[PDB]
Structures are given as structure tokens and as C-alpha cells.
A paper describes a structure:
The native structure was obtained from a crystal formed from a drop in the absence of substrates, which was then mixed with another drop, to which 10 mM maltoheptaose had been added. The intention had been to obtain a crystal of the complex, but no maltooligosaccharide ligands were observed in the electron density. TLC analysis of a similar crystal-drop, where HvPho1 was co-crystallized with maltoheptaose, revealed that the maltoheptaose was hydrolyzed, mostly to maltose and maltotriose. Accordingly no maltooligosaccharides were observed in the electron density of this HvPho1 crystal and we refer to it simply as the “native” crystal. Two almost identical HvPho1 monomers (R.M.S.D. = 0.19 Å), related by a quasi-crystallographic translation, are present in the asymmetric unit of the crystal. One of them had weak electron density for a citrate anion in the active site, likely a crystallization artifact as citrate was part of the mother liquor. Consequently, one citrate molecule was included in the final model. The structure is similar to those of the cytosolic phosphorylase of A. thaliana (AtPHS2), rabbit muscle phosphorylase B and E. coli MalP, including the presence of a pyridoxal-5’-phosphate prosthetic group covalently bound to Lys814 and similar dimerization interfaces. An overlay on rabbit muscle glycogen phosphorylase b suggests that HvPho1 does not contain a functional polysaccharide storage site. The ordered part of the L78 insertion overlaps with the location where glycogen (or starch) binds to phosphorylase, in a position incompatible with maltooligosaccharide binding.
Quantitative data about starch phosphorylase protein abundance and enzyme activity are lacking and no crystal structure of a plastidic plant starch phosphorylase has been reported so far. It is known that starch phosphorylases are members of the CAZy GT35 family of glycosyltransferases and catalyze the reversible transfer of glucosyl residues from a glucose donor onto the non-reducing end of an α-glucan chain. While Pho2 is localized in the cytosolic compartment, Pho1 is a true starch phosphorylase that acts on starch in the plastids of the plant cell. We determined the crystal structures of HvPho1, the first crystal structure of a plastidic plant starch phosphorylase. A native structure of HvPho1 and two complexes with acarbose and maltotetraose were solved and refined to resolutions of 2.7 Å, 2.9 Å and 3.0 Å respectively.
Author numbering:
A (entry chain A), B (entry chain A): 68 to 495, 553 to 968
Amino acid sequence: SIDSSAIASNIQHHADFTPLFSPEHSSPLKAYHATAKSVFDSLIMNWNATYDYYNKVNAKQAYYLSMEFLQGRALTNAIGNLELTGQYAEALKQLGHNLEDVASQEPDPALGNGGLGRLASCFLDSLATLNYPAWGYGLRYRYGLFKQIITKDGQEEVAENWLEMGNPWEIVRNDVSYPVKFYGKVVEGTDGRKHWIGGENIKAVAHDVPIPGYKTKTTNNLRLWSTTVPSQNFDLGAFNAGDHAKANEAHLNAEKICHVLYPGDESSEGKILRLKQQYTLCSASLQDIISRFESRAGDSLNWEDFPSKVAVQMNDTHPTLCIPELMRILMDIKGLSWNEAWSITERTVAYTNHTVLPEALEKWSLDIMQKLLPRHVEIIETIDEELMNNIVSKYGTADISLLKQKLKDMRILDNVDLPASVAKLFIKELDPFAKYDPQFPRVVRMANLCVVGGHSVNGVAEIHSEIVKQDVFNSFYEMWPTKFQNKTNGVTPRRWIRFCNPELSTIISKWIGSDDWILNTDKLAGLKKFADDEDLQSEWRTAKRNNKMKVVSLIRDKTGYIVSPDAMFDVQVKRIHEYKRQLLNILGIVYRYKKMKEMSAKDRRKSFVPRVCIFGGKAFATYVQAKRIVKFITDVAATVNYDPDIGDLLKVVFVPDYNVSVAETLIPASELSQHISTAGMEASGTSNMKFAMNGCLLIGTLDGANVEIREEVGEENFFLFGAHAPEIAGLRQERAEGKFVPDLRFEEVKEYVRSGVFGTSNYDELMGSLEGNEGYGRADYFLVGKDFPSYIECQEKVDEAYRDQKLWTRMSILNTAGSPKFSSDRTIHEYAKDIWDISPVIMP
Amino acid sequence: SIDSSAIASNIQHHADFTPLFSPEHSSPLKAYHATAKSVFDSLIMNWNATYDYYNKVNAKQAYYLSMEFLQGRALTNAIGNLELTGQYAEALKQLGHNLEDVASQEPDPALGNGGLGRLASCFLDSLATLNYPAWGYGLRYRYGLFKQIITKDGQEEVAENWLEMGNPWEIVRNDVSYPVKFYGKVVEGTDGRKHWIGGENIKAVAHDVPIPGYKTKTTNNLRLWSTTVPSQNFDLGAFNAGDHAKANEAHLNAEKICHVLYPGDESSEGKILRLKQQYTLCSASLQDIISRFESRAGDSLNWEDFPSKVAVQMNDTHPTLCIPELMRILMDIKGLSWNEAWSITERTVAYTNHTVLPEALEKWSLDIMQKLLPRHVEIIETIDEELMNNIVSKYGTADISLLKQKLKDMRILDNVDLPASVAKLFIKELDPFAKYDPQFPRVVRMANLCVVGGHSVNGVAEIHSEIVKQDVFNSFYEMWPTKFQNKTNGVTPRRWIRFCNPELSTIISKWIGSDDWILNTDKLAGLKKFADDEDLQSEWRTAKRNNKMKVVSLIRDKTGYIVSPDAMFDVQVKRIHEYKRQLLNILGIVYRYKKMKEMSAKDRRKSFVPRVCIFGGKAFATYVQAKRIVKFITDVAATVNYDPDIGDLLKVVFVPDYNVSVAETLIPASELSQHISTAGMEASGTSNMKFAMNGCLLIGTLDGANVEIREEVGEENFFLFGAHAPEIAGLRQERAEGKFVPDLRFEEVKEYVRSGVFGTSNYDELMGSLEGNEGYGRADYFLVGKDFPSYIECQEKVDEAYRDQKLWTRMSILNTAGSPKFSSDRTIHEYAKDIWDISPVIMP
Ligand SMILES: *Cc1c(COP(=O)(O)O)cnc(C)c1O
Ligand SMILES: *Cc1c(COP(=O)(O)O)cnc(C)c1O
């Protein structure tokens, strides 16, 4: 009773009765907005039912705050989760359209950037699919980070246009507006209570993005804050006098908070904005959560129940301000005591860490924060004093040098005059250590504040979670060992197998017996025994090849290069950074090119398997060397791809504007993917898990997610190379004292690049970053030269394996069979049970 | 088969499936947006049918361009014209709401200001109602002119908020975008043809506001341009470097065009913007009109047919640039010759003039225009050369001093070097007259360009249209007498009787026999014979009184003052200006107050009829004296309203933020309205006509619309006072040479105001503007003192008439009976036949 012909009518209805175009206009885009709105009707029904039932039950609700959400296109996945994928397809034929064609008109929401945000997004899919009561909270970015375009100069950055016609996947909630305050000062009022007055005032308005679960009515929510000020803040006097910018100054201030993701902060103005961004996310979100708690509790309202009804999860340090903000409201607005409020805060908040380096943890100038959020600094000050008295107790006086060290490590406010209580212990008068030294900045360490303020701290992979306990927060682990956990990352198998790779999905559900694996992904393990079946292997290679043909279109379309699908599709797809070592990959390609060119055309075929080597991802605009690296790759592509001696034996391609949509086409087509960061530098990595699910083989270092992926799929089905994490610091110091001697094959490439064969750029600057023994930006800090021989050898093993397409496809199948551990579903279960302490809420 | 219960469902549907609020939220406002969207579904159906049928028929289409459209609230009138007024009322009861209550939640669109715009709006109602194919073109103003608030300092100006939640009465047309260019320069290309290159580029996007006719499916359109630039014009480099305003500079430039109506132009930046505004309206609109002509013509496309398919009407001089812009496109883009293009332009364009003073006609600096629109100045230059050669022919050489005068009067470009052809005739070398004199600015006279460029020029009232021929454009009238016309203004009887005054409307349709008068307003004349019937008079006075009670609410609500409905409701409602003479009214009130206070409480009742004297309207922010006048009135209100000796004998009230919605409540309640501008200063006036329709009696000067209103309703049913137009200049010169001696009663008031009785302001400054014999801002230029005795006497006749509520109500009824001439319907018929040459297009 829910058929294709009624859907076609509702699509038509939306084109005409919620129109964005002239009636006689006929576009795939017009069809998209109509089809999006037809699907949306289902999400609204289900959203309202889910919203209402949660209020009735009043179960504990989890809240995931992130500065990023890589939502990607919604259409294909909403239709998928509703299981109207077959009927929407036909409905669109009736109207003279094609689903796939219409779906490719959807713009990627510019609401995230990399893994941090995509994880959050996968987490929202799993939460809904498994019927957990949970929302995401975030900011509604207009222009995103940037849309990447590739010219003959390298990468250029253009602002995103995804909101130009409005977002059909959201609902504005005009009754949901919260005030957020900047600057001002604090005064103690009549009733001993603190009051934060004056300053600047903006309002955050709610923009809801429903999150439909798979094979369930449960539709959770992503609440997005958009900043503005009321029309009356427009200065007409300024406007009429001619000063049109002044007239618009107040609106610009509010609105710019939601303009760009991670705005550049090499300026006091960029730092203030980045800080306004975070407080707005924290303040608006917490005010809303508090509001919902109150409305549900009704007359029987008790704040001790707050952490048994509310869980707040801080994705990275960006939402750290939740801690003091919660303390702010509980005391200043609700009237709770410090200890009463602190206990509620500590039990409500938890922190997830994605960093492996202790000098990559968010720091802020106290002076800047003190000016913008004076009441929060007061609160932080009190928190840091408590923390220090607890260290005093749990340790010393007796042994002071020890205590000195414990206080450095754990302090929230670094380089500040100690509170009078602690300062005592260092009289002799006071030790230089217990005083502000103007030679250095006064700094607020957000990571330490997150640890102190949350009941749980977790890493994102087994090895990393240990690094977190041993290197990063050691003295904290000593103090509160029970805080520290691990929650290995995962990705949703619905977006990243079922819907991005339908051809593989059919093969999977045939041989396993059902399509239940989409939900109960453990059942993929039943593929192990069929790994050597010849027929499975036939279908499995055909799918891979069919998925590769959609990439041929993408490459032709986006770059102009013509490539053959009968080569090996070798992909490296991640953010452009020296530590990720795209440079190691391209230089390995350069070596093989060189070998080919010093070889007979008979031997070229005998020695190397044909490849299409694909690069993708964004460089931080200001990062000069990263931009030179994408430039370098493009130039190699130009030289290699148009070389008669090579032909289809090797192609190199840089796919521009890598995003969720690109990944969705690229990943299912991939046979080899590269995860080759300097060992010890990666915490996890989620693209790794996506590739393996799609039967792509991994070449990588013993680093981040690769380690656990290798366990699950088997070491025989993974190409491992390079120095391990423990060996690094030693190899660097070895370099510093002149003892490192690079392979002859590595000097060959460097010289061959300095040769000019890749155009009118020489690159002596880039190659120069792999030379010397010391210096910032030089001295091959990320061990490209060191790992080179091991790496180019490992790629010879890949070639030899690809020669036996029996072995290759066997390993491909074993990767999909070993992926179950990396479903975000079991990641969420672990979070739900061991941190948030929430249960599923199933509607009847 | 279109019943109240289905409508209630559709209202509900829109609340839930085109939502702007949380689902559990319950507001009159929420009900409004839902009810608006339910009505809108009907407008869409009818809009699309009307749009499609016009394309089929390809009849000549009229296009009304204005910088203003005072649309007012749409809800009550759309529901009215659809005749679902009874069923929407019940549908809203079912949902626990009240139509009137819901309607009062609609914000007034800030798309206009005064009469200019309201006329345009009435014109759109009449065009639809009478089935004429016609659109309005305008700009989509965000903040409007300003929302007026009254404090203890006078008026203050706040930006309007009408778009904060979006406009339910519009449809964005994303496929309708047109490029508009600013600055740049001209170059003659390969093919002798001119090309306008470089400069700045913005895009105007179409926002359609359907205009439903009354008792007809015909739903015409108001196309509104909103300016923007594509996201990519956002400078990320600037944003990340910290310079967030610079990053937003390009967007601000585009968007500010649509920010404020009539932005202040005492700055080169305000003048450039005002000029960008007008060109954008002209360019975008003409590009669209041209596009529609082409798509309809198909293969059989002939540009000679353009003026037989297209009429462009310029409301005032603001759209003057249509003339050269049309010439631009026809030659530069379509390839027509000058004469071929000129003939098409002259036959397509027509001009309506609303000005009575020849020094109130829009002038622009040539230098500013030459910089912004260089190609348009070239075209204007050529037009002005033609014009001058035609004057040469039609006159002189022989008589040069004569020719000198004819060229001054008619020139488009004033104070410019004459073209070589004309310059000859003044050799002796060249006369100073035929040269640019840097002592004065170089000026472009837009009015003269409108006259030259249009086939018809019309005034807006019989007397004014004559002034236009005799004083304003005399030498043009001599040259082309057939151009000059009259089209007396009118107002729609649907918004301004039927829907604003339902209680009167019932009485009208009873005694006339039907409600057909709403359409065929001529049938109101049948009320003359019932003027003296006692029963009609009973119902008629009851309605007036019932309508007055809604004003009591408005006054209480907006000012706090408590007033009795059993007094005379005496209203002056128009823009605050010295020439309109609110000051004359208030000073007359001040005189009566003074008399009351020097009188016994028995006599106070014997001498004066109780009144509620209501003022309303906006002062130009920068106009110091106008603002002091509203301040002065408020202070009188404060003193008078709280005086025990007075009580309900006299109240004075300044209703803040006068707009369409205020008028709709105020007008039907009004018994006396004032139209007292210095004689000869007003061209027409439409509020005058509204009042008379609602049975309000007029006190006014022999000026503008009053003259014709007095003819139609009868001199016995109109309170005339003051000096007539011909006597003015003489009375002013009389003042200049010391010969004017004011009434003793006028010095009494002035002194009594200088007395301080009205608070801690003395007003010696304001009273000082009525004193002296010469000087800007002084010397009683608008004859307040002169007309005073005549005026306060005329008000004594009003009192004596109001005493006999038989006579008063007789005259009231005769005003409604005499109003038929002032229906915008017959105004439109005249425009349709004698200018646009269009016919109605009725769908089957
Ligand atoms: C999965 C995914 C990522 C994360 O990639 P890592 O290699 O884990 O950093 C980034 N971007 C997009 C578009 C993705 O789909
Ligand atoms: C009718 C009307 C006007 C025009 O009034 P005039 O006295 O003709 O200038 C102005 N404003 C509003 C809101 C109106 O309804």
C-alpha cells in the first residue's frame, strides 16, 4: 500500500506546491529538490513520532557535540534506510528521470572536513539504526572549509555554495532560539550570586537535520546552530549616512561564526572567532539540553537526576567549554552549590581524544579567554585550584620536586601565579616555578580541563588508547585510572557497503544467504569458507571491475584524463600533509616510471603490472609545502599520462575536491589503498576500514587502524612495510648526528626529479625538504627516505600478487570477511554501555 | 465540495509538513504561517494557470515598475478574493484559533512607504480583478524604510523584521537569474558593435508574489528582485587572515541594494547606491521582459512587434533608466539600428508623473552616472543630440534667444558642451551658454529624459495634469501635445471597504440589493436616495461606532492612552512634513484646548463637541523640524489627555508606526479626516479617497484629490477652507515685503506654546519657524498663520454639524455614494485603453 505511483505524485506535488523554480522549467536539479522533499515527508512523520515518544519515556539521552559533521548526500541513504529504493527508482522513470542522475545533483553539505566529522556522522547512523536516544549538536556552516579546484598552479580554494538554494534536509525551528554572550564582566549581586552582564549578545537558532535509522522508524536528530542578531541591530543611521558596512557590522559579527569551518587563527581576530564558535556550540547546546530536562521533569524536578538523564560527549577538545559552561548555568542560573554542580558536571561530561602527540592539544591564551569569557575563567580558576589540592593530598609536600612535576603535567592554567594554598609549599621567597613568568605566555590547556571535567576519557584504537595512558595523560591515569578507556572507531556498513556498493552487496547476500548482514555485520565472517570458490571469485572480480568504470567517468569528467579500467586501481585518499606522506607514494611512482623508461617495451610489461594511481584530498591553504606536493603530483600526471612509451601501463591522477560523494564512487572501485603515515603518527583512520569492507587491499605502516585491521583480516592479506613506532625517535636522532645514509635508489629519484623531466618547475625546494640533518621543514623528519627501500620493495610484492588474480581475489574476499569489527554499530554499543549508560528505546 | 473541514486539514498539513517550529509549539504565529500556506496553495494553482494561458495567447502584457509596493498584509484579502472567508473562519475555530487574531500576527511587508507604492499595489489588485495581463516589477527590500517607535524623545527609527522567518507569500525562482553590471567601460569591437566590459557584476534573482483577483481565477504577479553574488565571490584568503569584513565585501555590495528603501543620499556612497538600485530594477526587469517576448515568439520573431506585445510603465522618474537600457540591449545585444531601436523604445515606454513642483524632479550628477553606467551616458548623449536637432527644426536659428530658452527647458544634460551641430548656431567665439561652466554641476535631468523617451506622459489628477502641461513640461507640451494625458488616481474597494470594513459592507449590500458593488462600484450611487432614511442612518452610525471600538484597542495597546468611542474621531494620517501641515492641525487643537481652559465647565460642553484627535505617519529621519513636530504632538497628548478639567472632551493621540495595517483599522472608524496641505502642493492623495468611501467627512484645502472628491460628493458634504493655489506666490511675496499681519488668535497660540505648559521643552525653535519675513526654514513659507483663522473657523462649522447627527450621517452616506469615481478599477480601464492599449484575457 506504499507504491511507486503514489510517490511519483508526491514528487510532482512538491515540484509544484513547494516550488523553487518556474513551473515550465525542467531540470535534474528541480527533480532533486522535489524528490528530496518527497522523501523528507517520511522523515518528518518518523522524526515527530520519535521526538514525542522520547518525551513520554524520559530515558537517558546521549548528546554528541562535534565541530564537524561530514553528513554527505542524504538522498540515496534516506531512501535506502526507508527501503523505498526500488519504488523511488520507478517513480522517477514515470517522470522522465533517473535516480542516480538525480542523486548526483545533490551538493555535499559543507558541514565537516575529515575523519573527526565523518566519524560523528557514522555514529549518528548507528545510533538511529540501533534505536538509541541520541542527538548530534553542531554549527550550520555556510561556506564550509573550502571547495578544492585544481589548476595548472596546484590547488586553489573556493567557498562552498551548498546553501545557495536552501537545504531540503533541514527544518528551521523559530521557537528554539538561545542567547549567547561575549565579553562583558562579572559582578556579585544582591543575593551573593554571580551575574554575567553587558558585553555582546547574539542568538543561536536551531536547524534540525533528521537522521533516519535503517529498517526502523527511529529517526534521531542533528541540531545545528545558525547565528544571527535581530533586525533591530541594523544601524539605519550608519546606513543612510553612507557607511553601509558599519550599518551591517553587528550582523556580520553574529553571522561570521557560522561562515567558515576552522577559520585561520594566525591573527587575534581568527582566535577570537574560533573561540566564539566553540562557546556558541557549547552554550546553545547545553541551554537546549537543560531546557528539555526541565520540560520533561515537570513538577518532580531534581537536579541530582541530571547525569542519570543526560550524557554529553565532547568530540575532541573543541567542545571543552561545556565543562565550565555547565558549572556556570547550574550555579548562576539554577542556584546549585559548587560541589553539587561539580558532581553533576563530572558525571554528565565525557571526553574522546583523537590526538597521539602531546604537543597537538588545544591551547588558548588566558588573556584572550579572560576578555571574552571572564566568568568561565573564574570557574576554570576554581577547578584548577581544586585539582591542585587533590594532587597535594594524593602525593606530597614531603617530596616537592616530585610535586613540582605532577603539578606541571596536570595544571589547567600554565604559567600562572599559584593559588595561595598551593604556593605556600614552595616558600624559601616563592620559587620561580610558583609565579607568572612574562617571558612566556599564560596558557589554558584544554585537554587537561577535559580530563578533570569528564568521568571517562577514551582513545579511538587499542594502540592509541595505550599511548593516551602512557605518554599523553600519564599522571592523570595514575590518579584516576578508571577514567581511561578505549573505543575503537568504526564506519556504517549501510553508507559504506550497501548503498555505495550495491553490486558487491548483492553478491554478499547471495552467498551468506540473506541481507541481514547489513544490520548484523558479524555474519560477513561466513565468507571465509567461500574465499577459494571459483564462482564467487568470478562475480567478485566482475563487480570490482564494474565499480571501476564509474571512476573512469569521474576521472575523465573532473580531470580530462582517459584511463583504462583493466589496470590496478591504486588509491591514496586523505588530507595533504607531510606526515601522511603522499610524497612517499608519488616518489615511489616516480621510481617505477624511471625504471620503465630505462627498459625495453617487452620488459616493461614483464616487470610491472598496469596501474591507475589515484590521489585525492585537501591541503591546508596556508601550508606551503603541502600545496607544492599537490602541484608536484599534477605535474607528474601531465608528464606520465601523455607518454607514448608508457600508454596504459601507468596513469597518475589527482581527483579534485575529495569529499563523501567522491569517496562513495572511488572506494568501491579500489583494489589497493595506501595508509602510509610515519609509524606512530596516526590514532586510527576510518577510510582504512571502508576500503577493507569493499574488498580493497591495504598497503600501510604498522600505525593506527592498520594494526587492528591486520589482526582481523590476517597478516597474509595485508601489505606491511616500514619502521615501527618504537624505532622512530631513534632514527631521527640518528639523522641529527649524521649517521643516516640513504639508499642509492632514493638519491636516484631525487636527482631524477631535480632533472626537470616534470616541466618548468625543478622542485629543488621540495627535494630539499628531504635533505640536511636538522632544521624546521628539512631533514626528512617523517622518514620518507628511510622507509623508501622497504616501501618500493613492498610494492613489488603487490605486483606479484596482482599477477595471480586468484590469490588477489582470495585476499579481497578475506578483507570483507574480516571487517565486521569495524562496524560503527559495535562501536556505539560500547559507548552506550561503558560510558553513556543508555539503553535503546523502541517504539511499538 | 470545497468545505471548511478540508481547509482545516490543509492548515494542519502545512503546520506539520512545511514546518517552521517545533511540533509541540503552539502559537497564533505558527497558525498564521500554516494558514498563509494553505491559502497559498490556491494562489499557486491559479498563478500557474494564468501564467500558462498568457503564454498560449501571447496578448500584449503591461509591466508596472515602481520602487515601492505597499502590499500590506495578504491573508485577509487573498481569502476574500478567493471567497473562502466564511470557511477559513470556521476551519480556524476547529483548530482552536480565531481568524482575526491569526491575521494580526502577519507582519506588514516593508516593500513600500507612501502613496506612490500603495497606488501601485491597488493597481495590481484592479489589474487582476479585471483580467488584464500585467505584472508589477520591484525590489525585495529586507529592512524597508524603517519601523517607527515613539519614545519620550519623539520618533526613533528601527530596521524592519518582516523577513526574519521568511515570507510565505512568495516563491523563489532559481532558474530566473539575470546579470547586472556596474562601472566598467565601453569598447568598439571587431564588428563595429559596442561592447560594455569589465566593472562589477551581480545577479538579480526573481521572487514572485502572486496577486489574486476578486471573484476570478486570474492571478497576476509581482516579480521582486533580490540581489546577491555567487558563493565563490567570498574571499577565503581574507577570511582566514582575520579580515572577515573584507571576505564579505562583495556580498555586502550586492546585498545592500535590497537592504533599505530610499537610502540616504547626502553622500557620494548613498547616491551611487540609490542609482544601483534603480538600474538593477530596470535592467533585471527589462532582461526578463525581453526573454519572455523571445520565448513566446519562437521562430516567428520580429522586433517591430515588440511594442505591440509589451508596455512598460515608469512610476515616477525612479525607473527612467529603462529608456537607455532598452536602447542598450536592442542595439548592443540584438543588433538593431538606432532608429529601429528608438522607435520600439518610444512606443514601449510611458511615464507617470506625481510631482507638482518643477524643482522636485530627479537630477543626477553626470560624473557619477558616467562612472557607473558609461554606456548609458553615451546613449543619453545621442538622445539629447537628437532632441536638440528636433528643437532646431521645429523653431529657430532665426530667433536664437527664443531657441536658447527652448533648449534650456528641454535639455536632458544641463551645463554640458553642446554637440557640434547645435553649438554652431551660437558662434560670435562660442556663447558662454553653449559651454560647460565649472561654476555649476553637470546634471542629468531624468524627467525630461522620461518625456522624450515615452509615448505618453500623465498626471494623477485633473488639476495636476494641467499643471504638468502648463508649468512643468510646457515646451514639451507645445512640441508633442498628444503625449500628455490625465489618469486620476483611485483605490481598490475590496481592501478599502469590503475587507477593512465588513460591518459597513453588509449595510451597503442590503440597501443597494446586492454585493455586486464590490466589483461594479458605480452601483454605490443608489445610496443617494436613502441618505435621509432614518433606519439606514441608525445602522450606519452603529457601524461607525463599532469600527471605532477597534481603534480604542489600538490606542490603548500602542500608546497606553484610554479614550472614549463616543467622541468625534478626527484623524490626520500622512507623512510628517511642514508642507502637509500637521503643525496647522495641532496648533488648532492647541487653540481649542486654550479656549476650554479659559471657560466654565458648563460652557466647555456648550462650545465644543468631544473629540479624539489622531495623528499618524513617519518623519524623514534627517528632517530635524519634522521630528520636532511629532515630539511636539506627543507632548500635547501627555498634557491634554491627563488634564482633569478636560476629561473625555478632548484627547490627542499619536499612533506609532503608521502602515497599511494601521490604516485598515483607523480609516473605517474615522468621522473626520484632514487633508490640509498648502494649496497647490499636493498632486492627488489616495487616503482621501479611502476615507470618503468609509463615510468619513473631509476637512481640507482646494488641493489635489480634494478638488475632484468635492465635485463628486458635493460641496455641501465637504469642509473647505484656506487660500487657493493661485493666491499662494502672492501671499509669500506679500510676507517677504513686510505686509502680512497675523491674526491675534494666532499670536495667542504661539505665545501659549512658548509658555511651557506642554512640559520642559519650550519650542521657541518650532514657533520661530513661523516668524520673520525671509530665510530658509523660517517665515512661515507654508502659510500656517495665514490659513489659521479660516481653518479654526471651518472647524467650528464641523462641530455645529456633528451636533446634528442627522445631518452628519446624511453627509457620511453621501460621501460613500459619491466615491465610485475613485475606484482604481476605472483608473486601470483608462490606463489599459488610452496608454497600454491592452485587453483583458479571460480563461475559460
Ligand atoms: C572516511 C572519510 C575520511 C576519513 O579518512 P581518514 O583516512 O580516516 O582520515 C575523510 N573524508 C571523507 C570524505 C571520508 O569519507
Ligand atoms: C493610502 C495610504 C497612503 C497614501 O496616503 P496619502 O494621504 O494619499 O499620501 C500612505 N500610507 C498608507 C499605509 C496607506 O494605506
